[PDB]
Amino acid sequence: AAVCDICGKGPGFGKSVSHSHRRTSRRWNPNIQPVRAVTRPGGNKQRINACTSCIKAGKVSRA
Amino acid sequence: ATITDPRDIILAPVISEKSYGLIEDNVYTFVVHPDSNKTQIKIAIEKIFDVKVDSVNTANRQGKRKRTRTGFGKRKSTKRAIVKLAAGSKPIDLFGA
Amino acid sequence: GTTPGELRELTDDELKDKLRESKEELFNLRFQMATGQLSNNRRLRTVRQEIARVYTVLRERELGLA
RNA sequence: GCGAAUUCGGUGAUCCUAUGCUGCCGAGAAAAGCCUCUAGCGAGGACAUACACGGCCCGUACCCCAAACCAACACAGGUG
RNA sequence: GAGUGAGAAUGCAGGCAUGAGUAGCGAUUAGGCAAGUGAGAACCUUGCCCGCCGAAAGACCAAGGGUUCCUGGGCCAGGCCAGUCCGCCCAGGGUGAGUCGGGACCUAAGGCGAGGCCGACAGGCGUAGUCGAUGGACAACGGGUUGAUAUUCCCGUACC
RNA sequence: AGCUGUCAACCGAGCGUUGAUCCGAGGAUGUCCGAAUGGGGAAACCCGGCACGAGUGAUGUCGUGUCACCAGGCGCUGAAUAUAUAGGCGUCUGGGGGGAACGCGGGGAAGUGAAACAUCUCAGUACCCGUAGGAAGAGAAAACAAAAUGUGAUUCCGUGAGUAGUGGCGAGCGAAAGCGGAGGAUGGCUAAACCGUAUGCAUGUGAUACCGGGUAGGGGUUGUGUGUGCGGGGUUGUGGGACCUAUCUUUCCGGCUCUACCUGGCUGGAGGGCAGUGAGAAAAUGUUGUGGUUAGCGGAAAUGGCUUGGGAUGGCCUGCCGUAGACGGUGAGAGCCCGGUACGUGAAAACCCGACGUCUGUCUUGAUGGUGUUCCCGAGUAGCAGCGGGCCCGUGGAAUCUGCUGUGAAUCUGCCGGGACCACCCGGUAAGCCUGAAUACUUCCCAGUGACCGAUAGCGGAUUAGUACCGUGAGGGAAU
Ligand SMILES: [Mg+2]
Ligand SMILES: [Mg+2]
Ligand SMILES: [Mg+2]
Ligand SMILES: [Mg+2]
Ligand SMILES: [Mg+2]
Ligand SMILES: [Mg+2]
Ligand SMILES: [Mg+2]
Ligand SMILES: [Mg+2]
Ligand SMILES: [Mg+2]
Ligand SMILES: [Mg+2]
Ligand SMILES: [Mg+2]
Ligand SMILES: [Mg+2]
Ligand SMILES: [Mg+2]
Ligand SMILES: [Mg+2]
Ligand SMILES: [Mg+2]
Ligand SMILES: [Mg+2]
Ligand SMILES: [Mg+2]
Ligand SMILES: [Mg+2]
Ligand SMILES: [Mg+2]
Ligand SMILES: [Mg+2]
Ligand SMILES: [Mg+2]
Ligand SMILES: [Mg+2]
Ligand SMILES: [Mg+2]
Ligand SMILES: [Mg+2]
Ligand SMILES: [Mg+2]
Ligand SMILES: [Mg+2]
Ligand SMILES: [Mg+2]
Ligand SMILES: [Mg+2]
Ligand SMILES: [Mg+2]
Ligand SMILES: [Mg+2]
Ligand SMILES: [Mg+2]
Ligand SMILES: [Mg+2]
Ligand SMILES: [Mg+2]
Ligand SMILES: [Mg+2]
Ligand SMILES: [Mg+2]
Ligand SMILES: [Mg+2]
Ligand SMILES: [Mg+2]
Ligand SMILES: [Mg+2]
Ligand SMILES: [Mg+2]
Ligand SMILES: [Mg+2]
Ligand SMILES: [Mg+2]
Ligand SMILES: [Mg+2]
Ligand SMILES: [Mg+2]
Ligand SMILES: [Mg+2]
Ligand SMILES: [Mg+2]
Ligand SMILES: [Mg+2]
Ligand SMILES: [Mg+2]
Ligand SMILES: [Mg+2]
Ligand SMILES: [Mg+2]
Ligand SMILES: [Mg+2]
Ligand SMILES: [Mg+2]
Ligand SMILES: [Mg+2]
Ligand SMILES: [Zn+2]
């Protein structure tokens, strides 16, 4: 759920920073959404995990 | 090339007091290749010696462990075949009697 | 007792005959040594090498090297 | 090597009939095997008797309530 | 130019004192005599007695061990003494199955797990499967014989 | 000219001047386990299918091949279900595991320091994950610089400097420009505008179309949108290129483009250049080099005297060689006794480095102006915002670089950098790719060295050493 199946977009790693400046490890996960994508006009759908960026760019399509 | 021969299975005769006592009963003991089985040995013995084999019995024997200054060593394990010849068959002349 | 030169002169089937002959001779020698009536121990080594020679020659003829 | 008699009773199982029976509530494996049913194979096939044959691989010695196993010991412990 | 000087760190390794020829020599049964062997005998062998265990300290297995088993030899290590003896040392020998106990038959818990789903990576689970006896199915009994194996070899009679 | 490895002899047998043992190179064989891969399994042991062959009276049995899974080509088939697709068959090509260090990209401690401790430090260390290569990464300016008529890809070394700075301004941390060097390639190829062609998806039966005039014929849908692939064209910052449109110069022969005539194309084949296995296209294949590596062989000169001694290689005294007086050995300090040394010499084969050919590419019309509110110049990109990471820089006035989440442009008057930001100048031309050398390391192999150790030292290991032994196991681990 943190890896896109089209572009390979993975999570980033970094730090959450407290007011007292305590640095704790955390992830920045990609916003990936389940999409029932198609392959040809009017065809069978297949569930894939696509990031919102790919959906916005039209790299996945629906019917 | 591989040219299989029955004699490849049958390595040596067993020479011992028990073995001679069995030869008196027309029963001969051979050391055989560890992988061999009773049927293979029966076929091989009857082909080599041109004799009817009644039954073949087998037994595995673990090698003895011997001490040395260098430490413990182990002799080879072997497989023996007690071969009974059919009644009415010519005795085998190769055990040395 | 037989050299590679002489072995290369025999036909394929004559080599296979010689191989059986040598295996029978080795079998007899092993029994004679277990009975302890074999004087010339060295015949075992020589017969075994003769078998190895015949195999080598046969394999060379299959691989087209002869 | 030769080799007698070998009957009758009594007692009696924690073993067998018994995967039985009777009672109870906590309500007591699976699969192969075997039997049967068709589907589907089928021109050859079933049964019986006689004779001749095949029947593989691993374990098999010895200790095993012990100085041979677990215990540093030829150890008052432990072992189904 | 220095791995350059030890008496001590409850310092480290090896050798060896003191305690001391002292404590022990591991149950709750117990040994004795005659004869033998031998350089040597309380302990080894044989005979005759005595004593102890006898739901065991008898008999047969699984697990585990691995030649400790049998025959011949040995006796400077080992055995809490000695030793001619040994479960110790050395050489040779010894374990025979269609029916016994397993596999080639079957599954249980559980394990692994084609694809698969999940998970940044590492991986986590699991379907079809495939393994996995402590259980299910499946044909042999009595006698004799070796120094050492025997429902295995042999004899008699069976069964799949 | 002696051999049958060694601890290690002893016995018992044999080979060798018809060349053994031994040394180098290339082949053959290579049980079982192990990624382990026919199936199974407690690694090295249990059980098979299929094909061919062997063996049985037949069953049993025995050889030799072949049979895991996944990914990607190619072929067949196309469920629910119509189009189809998922999937299922068949077949070819790969991957899997291991390795001491060095590389790159990710994840990422704590003891500790701060004489407490949380920011900070330790430290992007230890460890871990994914992947390499013989090296890797980086690399051809959306760079620096500061008005100097500057430098000109990257990497690495020395400086700049314990400086500018940074920092509970505590403990600490800590650049870059510039300058001096190593290396030589200030290296190459692509995307678009616009032509040509193939073909997917829409249309159309009429205009269109058929290179373009001026035409003259003809042919009749060959058309017309839009997408994709493959050839031309285009590779740039003084902006460049396409499109136009003057000028001057140009190998030969075709062939084509409906018919000639001009005239554009495009495409063969001859002359000629210019490159090549490399980054700049790929795979081959001959000849040749006292070029190299993997065995070796030769190689000068004292049996010298006397003395000591078991032994001379000691002492004393003579002579000799030296392109050789390295270092060992030999009964005690040996250039002249031995292995050698200086110096020379040698390779059938295999491998490696060349050169030369074949062979493969590629090119062959270029120069020269003008012209323009014409087209193109790498988009979910840049920019911006939120939360982080990293930079000397700990959020700071915080630029530059970078992850995730939103939002989201312009094609040269464009856009991005010159430490907030704006203006003006200067530099550069992002969102495509490739790239040798200078640098890092040594499991292993060869030749050497030491004011290194010399048996409690040196490796844990001079002795069966990762052995004995200890531990269920990871692991620990001697002594001689
Ligand atoms: Mg990070
Ligand atoms: Mg911290
Ligand atoms: Mg073979
Ligand atoms: Mg039998
Ligand atoms: Mg058996
Ligand atoms: Mg022994
Ligand atoms: Mg009677
Ligand atoms: Mg027994
Ligand atoms: Mg014990
Ligand atoms: Mg005890
Ligand atoms: Mg010192
Ligand atoms: Mg001292
Ligand atoms: Mg001391
Ligand atoms: Mg004392
Ligand atoms: Mg006292
Ligand atoms: Mg006292
Ligand atoms: Mg006392
Ligand atoms: Mg006692
Ligand atoms: Mg006496
Ligand atoms: Mg006593
Ligand atoms: Mg009593
Ligand atoms: Mg005994
Ligand atoms: Mg004994
Ligand atoms: Mg004795
Ligand atoms: Mg003794
Ligand atoms: Mg004693
Ligand atoms: Mg299960
Ligand atoms: Mg699983
Ligand atoms: Mg899988
Ligand atoms: Mg099973
Ligand atoms: Mg069971
Ligand atoms: Mg017994
Ligand atoms: Mg396998
Ligand atoms: Mg498996
Ligand atoms: Mg369909
Ligand atoms: Mg790998
Ligand atoms: Mg502190
Ligand atoms: Mg402190
Ligand atoms: Mg590179
Ligand atoms: Mg400062
Ligand atoms: Mg193009
Ligand atoms: Mg400029
Ligand atoms: Mg002298
Ligand atoms: Mg010298
Ligand atoms: Mg650009
Ligand atoms: Mg930061
Ligand atoms: Mg700026
Ligand atoms: Mg690159
Ligand atoms: Mg010493
Ligand atoms: Mg040492
Ligand atoms: Mg422990
Ligand atoms: Mg152990
Ligand atoms: Zn995506």
From Swiss-Prot, chain B:
Residues in the signal sequence: none
InterPro entries, alphabetized: Nucleotide-bd_a/b_plait_sf, Ribosomal_uL23-like, Ribosomal_uL23/eL15/eS24_sf, Ribosomal_uL23_CS
Pfam families noted in UniProt: Ribosomal_L23
A cellular-component GO term for this protein: ribonucleoprotein complex
Molecular function GO terms recorded: rRNA binding; structural constituent of ribosome
Keyword tags: Ribonucleoprotein, Ribosomal protein, RNA-binding, rRNA-binding
Source organism, top-level taxon: Bacteria
Keyword check for Disulfide bond: no
Entry keyword annotation includes rRNA-binding: yes
Single GO biological process annotation from the record: translation
UniProt record similarity statement: Belongs to the universal ribosomal protein uL23 family.
Subunit structure, as described in the record: Part of the 50S ribosomal subunit. Contacts protein L29, and trigger factor when it is bound to the ribosome.
Purpose: One of the early assembly proteins it binds 23S rRNA. One of the proteins that surrounds the polypeptide exit tunnel on the outside of the ribosome. Forms the main docking site for trigger factor binding to the ribosome.
NCBIfam families: PRK05738.2-4 (NF004363), PRK05738.2-5 (NF004364)
Protein name: Large ribosomal subunit protein uL23
Swiss-Prot record, chain C:
Domain of life of the source: Bacteria
Protein name: Large ribosomal subunit protein uL29
Gene Ontology biological process: translation
HAMAP family: Ribosomal_uL29
Keywords for the protein's UniProt record, in alphabetical order: Ribonucleoprotein, Ribosomal protein
Family label: Belongs to the universal ribosomal protein uL29 family.
Entry's Gene Ontology molecular function annotations: structural constituent of ribosome
Gene Ontology CC annotations of this record: cytosolic large ribosomal subunit
Family matches, as PANTHER family: 60S RIBOSOMAL PROTEIN L35/50S RIBOSOMAL PROTEIN L29, LARGE RIBOSOMAL SUBUNIT PROTEIN UL29C
